[PDB]
Amino acid sequence: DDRRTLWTTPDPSPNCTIDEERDSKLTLVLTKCGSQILANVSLLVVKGKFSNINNNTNPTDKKITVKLLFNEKGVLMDSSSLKKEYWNYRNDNSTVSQAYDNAVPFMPNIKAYPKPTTDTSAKPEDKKSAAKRYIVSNVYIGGLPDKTVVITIKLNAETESAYSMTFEFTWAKTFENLQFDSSSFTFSYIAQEN
Amino acid sequence: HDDRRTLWTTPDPSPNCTIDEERDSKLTLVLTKCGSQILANVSLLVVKGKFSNINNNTNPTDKKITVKLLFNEKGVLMDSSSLKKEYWNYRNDNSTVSQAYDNAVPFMPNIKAYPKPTTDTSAKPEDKKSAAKRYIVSNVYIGGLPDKTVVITIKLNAETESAYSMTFEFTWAKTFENLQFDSSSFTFSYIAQEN
Amino acid sequence: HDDRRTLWTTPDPSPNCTIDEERDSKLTLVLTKCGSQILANVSLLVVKGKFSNINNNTNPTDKKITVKLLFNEKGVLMDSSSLKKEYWNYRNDNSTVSQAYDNAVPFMPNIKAYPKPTTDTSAKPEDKKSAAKRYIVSNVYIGGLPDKTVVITIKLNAETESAYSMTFEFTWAKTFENLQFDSSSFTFSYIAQEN
């Protein structure tokens, strides 16, 4: 039993809805290293549209969005892309018996990543960072170096939640009969506390 | 409340960093000690002066930002650093410990992994020291926009004037037009010194 | 003292890695356990042989380096690994513990996350296992120079002859001209096994 790891499991059952119910397996591991969460994420789409990307037949199919929305206790809300049953603290290679009550120490820090406001100040010195809540990099479908995908992670940008972590996968290339299967990506973010 | 495993700006700093003019930028830098590695997270918002409004039509040579942290043998930030000292400290809640730290050696880049560059080329060519190992190079994105590519170059212990150093170099090849420098967050690690 | 939360080369290794000829490279690899994840940091300097002076005018096919770590069921490095065993160990200061380790299972890539590839023509298409999840693919830069791009491909538990494995593949498309292979440092993580 391990409250320093919040994860899917390492080998989840279909646990993620992109197009149809549970069409994907999100493997997401959050490990608390004090003031930072060390995050690791991979996504396999097992059925439906993104199990077979074809941008000759479907030229608009170039984006996948996975949304994790959390309430003020850091509990996953039902409106999340990820399903709740095996999103929990680590026990061995599974989850603790019952649903967690609190994961605030795993939430994106609300000072670093405040909930977006519509501030009326033009003055570039009054600007709140737009970019700081983003992690943007590349992952590779099948770990093939030519199959470039942009991964965009955004923290606490979702309006209808206390905290949020969204994963956006986009590609410019024309993929042809290609199962969405992302090489693993590691990032970190500043942690909230109790 | 008080946390010697985190050395940070705060997570929401006041202007704390000089690129062009005094305190024209906000560097958000968190160093978290995970034993023999420091887990580093860095973002930079330029609030005033040249890089608060990059324009490479008017200023085609404005394609580089260098932020230097220089540390003495105790790991104290030297006044010549780009980063200002007032809120560079160990974590207390979402702020810093009351008084200035006197020692942060355990957050310094390991001096065996990243020795201070020497003026020796007389070495046995196989005893030649890595030039690259002290570098982290990747991309960040202004506004997190995927077209606004910036190269981030981090260099450890390369500054001659200091016992330890951590330098952030942001460069771009594209012609940016009235664009506030605002980098997506970057995570890296480095091998830690010890006391 | 002694630190079983760090499994490393040393931070400043002697030639410890065979790419072409015996001990022609220095691999600096640090694995630090942060619970259910290993925080990994890797850099590679080739000190002698072909890749100490890459020339793709003279040798246009010399565009790949592979470093293989193979582990048995106890997480002990097997002799068929690219890396040499003498200074692959738990941390003591900037060196290794006196005696070779018996067990490093808690540093191995998680076998549920990264199962050994099977040749299963039993294939309910929805039960198809990830090909990509065991990969980390990114760029490093020789000399930390932004133009000297190298692809780094890390694969976990893909080697057939071992209980666990971690392979580093460096590739480039550009024509390098009298360039010592010297990679900027790369940080990643992976999900840890436990005992």
Automatic annotation (TrEMBL), chain A:
It is found in: Host nucleus; Virion. It comes from the Viruses. Its main location: host cell. One of its GO terms (biological process) is adhesion receptor-mediated virion attachment to host cell. Keywords: Capsid protein, Host nucleus, Host-virus interaction, Late protein, Viral attachment to host adhesion receptor, Viral attachment to host cell, Virion, Virus entry into host cell. One of its GO terms (cellular component) is host cell nucleus. Residues 1-193 form the Adenoviral fibre protein knob domain. Belongs to the adenoviridae fiber family. This is Fiber. It comes from Human adenovirus 32. The gene is L5.
